[PDB]
Amino acid sequence: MELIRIAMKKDLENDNSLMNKWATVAGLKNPNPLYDFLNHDGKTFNEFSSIVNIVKSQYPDREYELMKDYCLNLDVKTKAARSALEYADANMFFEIEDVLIDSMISCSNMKSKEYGKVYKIHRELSNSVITEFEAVKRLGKLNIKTPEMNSFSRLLLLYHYLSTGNFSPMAQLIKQIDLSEISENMYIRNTYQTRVHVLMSNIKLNENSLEECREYSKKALESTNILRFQVFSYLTIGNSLLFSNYELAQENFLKGLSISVQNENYNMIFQQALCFLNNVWRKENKWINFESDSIMDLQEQAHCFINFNENSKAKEVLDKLDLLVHNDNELAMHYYLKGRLEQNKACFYSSIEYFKKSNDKFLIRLPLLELQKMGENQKLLELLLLLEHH
Amino acid sequence: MELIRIAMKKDLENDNSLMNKWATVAGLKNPNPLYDFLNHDKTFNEFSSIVNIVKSQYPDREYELMKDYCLNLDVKTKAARSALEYADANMFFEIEDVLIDSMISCSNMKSKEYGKVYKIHRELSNSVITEFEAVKRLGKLNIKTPEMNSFSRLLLLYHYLSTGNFSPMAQLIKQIDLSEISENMYIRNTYQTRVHVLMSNIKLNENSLEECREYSKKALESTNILRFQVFSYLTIGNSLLFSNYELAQENFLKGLSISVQNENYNMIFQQALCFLNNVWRKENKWINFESDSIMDLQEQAHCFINFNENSKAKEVLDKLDLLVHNDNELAMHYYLKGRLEQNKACFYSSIEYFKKSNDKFLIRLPLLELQKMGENQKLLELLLLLEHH
Amino acid sequence: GMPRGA
Amino acid sequence: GMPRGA
């Protein structure tokens, strides 16, 4: 008897009116299946959102404890399990996702087996256990038949490109996704819809299409009750305002902190967003993480030092960063900081080069402004914006 | 009787060994079709047979002898289709346009197909139609022969070359597969020369100068047609413009020496030498002071700036402003304004339009001026690395 | 650097 | 400019 079941019946005696609301809350205006769910041992809803919307409505503070207990005592061969895989991955509940995967690979239902097999590919790719090439070759060798995993096998590449600052292939790959081909799993279709809203928001951000970036994050927020998607929607809205609206950017990041109070990784992300915001506006910056040797945290230490004419301390930090391997978008920021510290236009040109290489049309505004401030010719600046990398 | 056959018989009466001679010139495995060609009002199976004989024995009257022979052909035959390419390759537009309208009206479908897409090529190169119109017309034709599927791409390549629009050429030339032309070897061979000279120009535009020269030297080895020899020497000489003054000059003068009796080809090598001497900032005896073409006015301005006559240069450049420039011509216009004004923004517009035309060779002119004005080496590298989209 | 995520 | 052709 799942903790969700033990707790749901216990609480129904004290408050007996829940049937009418729970059936309204679970995508049934007519309460027949709830009775079935509530009493007979092992009978799932047709759609996974019925359990989800109930737990978030009656035990929101115990979502993880209950969903973990329910998900791991699930027949991996069922539709409910396949929905749960996407629930666990979307929420970044790796404890739930990884046990399901190894169970969906070993079982004898073929649909659940394909699901586990490409979610495994996504997990090894995002953990740098395999390369993009190894992932693409294994995806092709699966002979993916379901329109669920044909959508996901594209999504998992989109996540890989975003995290390694390789923005060039995103716009065309995401255009290949057609979620209308998913007709048997509505939860998966709706949570993939939110995934695409968030990925499209980032693609619009990287193209410096700032009004459309914010429209897509709005759709993402309107479309989900999943914290992870809300987190990155507010991060992306806030990032889109970095260069124009300090107060509104900060408000989105602070709203992010507010909903991340029980999650360290999400909390860290908004501190880094606010840290970058205050460096761009060259303000005193309480958000710097001095106990970190990641590229992102070291760069913001040096950025603040440079802002406040602490040039020796900044060269100390850029000396540590020199010994670290950067992706193309990270090297472009390294050169921008170098160029500020040395007032060296050649670094600002190397910065533009790697921003072009990663196809980041948003952050390139940083080296371009400095070149403007150094009196670079206006026609040259226009040429640098017009030209593209191969 | 056609003049070619009248003349061949008058010389046969006096010289009998001419038969084995004309038979080997024409590449014949045996001498039967020559006799047959002289006796019955018939064709050789390959057009090169009669061309090589006219070129071997009557080179001074090729135009007269071929204009008479071609215009007397039955437009339904492989011979007449071959004469269409011969005419267009030689730029014998008088012979060509007559064949075209004959073929377009005729009841033969192959001749009809050749005629209609050679007409598209003629109308596009005379700007009677736009590129969009040409592509639209070619698509409706439902072209079936490999020859015309190849020439449909060649006519577009010529149009890109002449309008300074070099970006599409590399991908389009690769679509040509001449090995599929199996029936008309004369067409396969003259198209092979056409592709060699076009490839030479694409490698020049990519600043791949040794491969540029190799393709032009392959064109020369493949051809006995003046027009292809002319553009091979032009392209070899252009590829040397920045490095080897004497050898560039020697290739242009070689072109002049074969162009003697042809005012259009002669003008081209004069323009080539005029540009060479301006690039090297030498006394320039090749300037056309009686021209209002953009090409010639630019070189007047270029030489004036070279010899510190900047009031005269601005007079010229003020005229050029009133003319419509394609992208490649515009890039040269900004380079000259850059030199006259010593203004880096003009040099930046120059490279912008060289990037748009995809001209990686002539872009070395504004790049070198920016180097002299002390522009950052990393900036110049970046500008060479990035592409126009 | 600037955090990004989806 | 520089003449070109093929």
Residue numbers in the entry:
A (entry chain B): 1 to 390
B (entry chain A): 1 to 41, 43 to 390
C (entry chain D), D (entry chain C): 1 to 6
What does the paper say about this structure?
Recently, in Bacillus phages, a peptide communication system named the arbitrium system was identified that plays an essential role in lysis–lysogeny decisions during infection of Bacillus host cells. This system requires the arbitrium hexapeptide to bind to its cellular receptor AimR to regulate transcription of the lysogeny negative regulator gene aimX. AimR is composed of two domains, a N-terminal domain that is responsible for DNA binding and a C-terminal domain that specifically recognizes the arbitrium peptide.
In this study, we reoptimized the crystals and collected new datasets for AimR with or without the peptide. Finally, we traced the density of the DBD for AimR with or without the peptide. In the apo- and peptide-bound form, the AimR dimer exhibits an inverted trapezoid-like fold. The distance between the two aspartic acid residues in the inner cavity, D15 of AimRA and D15 of AimRB, is approximately 125 Å in apo- or peptide-bound AimR. The C-terminal domain coordinates the arbitrium peptide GMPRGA via its four atypical TPR repeats. The arbitrium peptide enriched the low-FRET species, while the high-FRET population was reduced. Upon peptide binding, AimR is trapped in the open state, and it is difficult to transition to the closed state. In turn, the peptide inhibits AimR binding to the target DNA.
